[PDB]
Amino acid sequence: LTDAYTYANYDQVKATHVYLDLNVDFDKKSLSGFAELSLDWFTDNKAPLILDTRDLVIHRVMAKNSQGQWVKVNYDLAKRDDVLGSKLTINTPLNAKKVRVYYNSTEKATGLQWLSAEQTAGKEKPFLFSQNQAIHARSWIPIQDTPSVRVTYTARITTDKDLLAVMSANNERDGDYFFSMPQAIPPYLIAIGVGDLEFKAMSHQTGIYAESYILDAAVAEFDDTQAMIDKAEQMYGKYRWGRYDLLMLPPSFPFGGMENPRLSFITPTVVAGDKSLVNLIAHELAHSWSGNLVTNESWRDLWLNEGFTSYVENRIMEAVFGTDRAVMEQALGAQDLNAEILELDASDTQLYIDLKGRDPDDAFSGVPYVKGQLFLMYLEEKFGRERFDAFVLEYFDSHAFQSLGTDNFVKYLKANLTDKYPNIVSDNEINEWIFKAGLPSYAPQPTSNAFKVIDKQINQLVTDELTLEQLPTAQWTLHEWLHFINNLPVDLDHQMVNLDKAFDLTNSSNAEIAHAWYLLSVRADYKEVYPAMAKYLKSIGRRKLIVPLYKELAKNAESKAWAVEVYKQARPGYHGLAQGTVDGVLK
Ligand SMILES: [Zn+2]
Numbered sequence: 008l009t010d011a012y013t014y015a016n017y018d019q020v021k022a023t024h025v026y027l028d029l030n031v032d033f034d035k036k037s038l039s040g041f042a043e044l045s046l047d048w049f050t051d052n053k054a055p056l057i058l059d060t061r062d063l064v065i066h067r068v069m070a071k072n073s074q075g076q077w078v079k080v081n082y083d084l085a086k087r088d089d090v091l092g093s094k095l096t097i098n099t100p101l102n103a104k105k106v107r108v109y110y111n112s113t114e115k116a117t118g119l120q121w122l123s124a125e126q127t128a129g130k131e132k133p134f135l136f137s138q139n140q141a142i143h144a145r146s147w148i149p150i151q152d153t154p155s156v157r158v159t160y161t162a163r164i165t166t167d168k169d170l171l172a173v174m175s176a177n178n179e180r181d182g183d184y185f186f187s188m189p190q191a192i193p194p195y196l197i198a199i200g201v202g203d204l205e206f207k208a209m210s211h212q213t214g215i216y217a218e219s220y221i222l223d224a225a226v227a228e229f230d231d232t233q234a235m236i237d238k239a240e241q242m243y244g245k246y247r248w249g250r251y252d253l254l255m256l257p258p259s260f261p262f263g264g265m266e267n268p269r270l271s272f273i274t275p276t277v278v279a280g281d282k283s284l285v286n287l288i289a290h291e292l293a294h295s296w297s298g299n300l301v302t303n304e305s306w307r308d309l310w311l312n313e314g315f316t317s318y319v320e321n322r323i324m325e326a327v328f329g330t331d332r333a334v335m336e337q338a339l340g341a342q343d344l345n346a347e348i349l350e351l352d353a354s355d356t357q358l359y360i361d362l363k364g365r366d367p368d369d370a371f372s373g374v375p376y377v378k379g380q381l382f383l384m385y386l387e388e389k390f391g392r393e394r395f396d397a398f399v400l401e402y403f404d405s406h407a408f409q410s411l412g413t414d415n416f417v418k419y420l421k422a423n424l425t426d427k428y429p430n431i432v433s434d435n436e437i438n439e440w441i442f443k444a445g446l447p448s449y450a451p452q453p454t455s456n457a458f459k460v461i462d463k464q465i466n467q468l469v470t471d472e473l474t475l476e477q478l479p480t481a482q483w484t485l486h487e488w489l490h491f492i493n494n495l496p497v498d499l500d501h502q503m504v505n506l507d508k509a510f511d512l513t514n515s516s517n518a519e520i521a522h523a524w525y526l527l528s529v530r531a532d533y534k535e536v537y538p539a540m541a542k543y544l545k546s547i548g549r550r551k552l553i554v555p556l557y558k559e560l561a562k563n564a565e566s567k568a569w570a571v572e573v574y575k576q577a578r579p580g581y582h583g584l585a586q587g588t589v590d591g592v593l594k
Pocket residue numbers: 264266313316
């Protein structure tokens with residue numbers, strides 16, 4: 008029961024399957040039908056089935072008694088929590104083997120985005136998609152929303168004729184689809200998308216679903232993913248899910264992607280045209296092992312997820328693209344970790360983070376990913392890949408479709424590494440790594456030559472105050488451009504213009520570029536890139552591409568006001584998960 012946030016008494020009862028009978032109503036913006044949990048009881052004496060819910064409407068609850076008869080049981084729907092929602096206590100027959108809840112979700116459901124046909128690319132049909140991480144599955148599924156509880160699911164979804172349903176299971180149009188996931192997964196991984204979707208594959212087990220405009224552009228961009236999976240299997244074990252597809256969501260998607268088994272939800276912001284932001288997909292394919300195959304039991308073990316997924320993400324990048332692309336990305340990333348540790352509370356920089364009773368979304372940083380990566384990179388360098396990678400492979404094989412907590416990871420990390428090959432790493436470096444704030448100083452600090460030739464170059468003194476701009480720009484990769492803009496000095500102000508007029512980083516195609524540019528601009532007061540930044544902020548709603556922009560922007564009361572004026576235009580359209588965040592950084 009290492010886990011607040013769940014009213015679910017997963018102590019005595021545990022659901023092993025979920026049959027969903029739902030109807031997708033776009034006018035009422037609600038899914039309505041029923042959830043049929045199949046349970047496994049541990050205690051011989053009577054106990055209630057406690058389930059998590061949110062802005063769910065309950066019609067009736069049934070359970071199967073000692074004689075398989077669907078009898079009506081009664082429930083209590085507790086007062087709504089601000090973060091956990093309303094606890095549903097259903098009074099179930101001693102050992103009820105099943106329970107059927109009849110409900111609907113409401114449009115205020117926090118785990119679902121209802122996009123009007125106009126907020127879509129087709130402009131003709133609306134679009135729906137889920138995001139159930141961390142604790143939003145309950146907003147449209149009465150269940151034990153806990154990463155500690157894994158269930159298989161089958162689901163009968165009803166939609167309109169001329170709309171397609173997708174989920175994180177096997178899809179065998181008409182408007183009557185039924186999906187099946189025979190693989191036990193925690194709820195945050197139950198996902199659904201409905202819209203005017205088209206499908207093209209790329210390989211034998213990889214394809215894409217999208218709105219046509221981005222379809223072929225997307226298939227041209229991730230046609231490497233098959234490679235990700237073959238190189239990834241080589242070192243990490245088999246891809247136990249069968250198929251791996253990509254679901255491009257509309258520009259409104261708040262994140263960069265969700266690792267929904269068999270169907271990763273990807274932001275359109277990565278279809279750049281040059282394959283530069285592709286580590287995102289290598290990153291979502293990494294979850295297949297960390298955070299999907301083996302999942303954190305609570306949200307304080309969230310690093311066992313992002314950490315390892317970030318580490319494996321890079322490896323897959325080295326294997327298919329080469330270690331120079333690979334460490335060019337570890338550096339670029341470690342620079343932000345350092346920047347975040349600085350703006351962060353010296354309590355959140357810990358790996359086994361304390362949530363303090365916060366929202367699993369509020370309490371969220373880059374820490375567990377990069378610091379959890381440097382951590383495993385530390386054990387790599389310490390033991391070697393042979394030994395480290397054999398261990399990591401067993402680690403995934405041994406926890407196949409299981410849950411794990413920080414304390415136990417340690418027990419295993421010791422019994423299978425740190426103690427297997429003794430006297431290399433001490434339990435002080437282990438404890439220090441996962442429990443203490445900031446970085447250990449002896450923490451790997453990936454360094455990229457190419458980057459660092461640039462470092463030397465950024466030294467064109469006061470400005471064209473040694474060297475012209477006849478640098479190797481015409482050879483600069485996306486990575487090499489973010490490093491330039493990134494450690495370029497914040498004292499260029501206007502001084503800045505050669506830069507934009509020569510390379511035009513303002514109207515820069517790649518979004519990452521546009522980002523780092525406006526970030527630096529507003530910092531140095533390059534006040535010139537405010538209009539382009541406006542459309543940018545109004546257009547895209549990915550958090551990690553507007554959030555930090557709204558932060559720096561909202562730190563000069565005169566500037567912080569320009570924010571509210573635009574955030575009042577871009578506000579509608581953003582995903583709730585984003586609005587929420589920007590709503591706080593904008594006072
Ligand atoms: Zn992730």
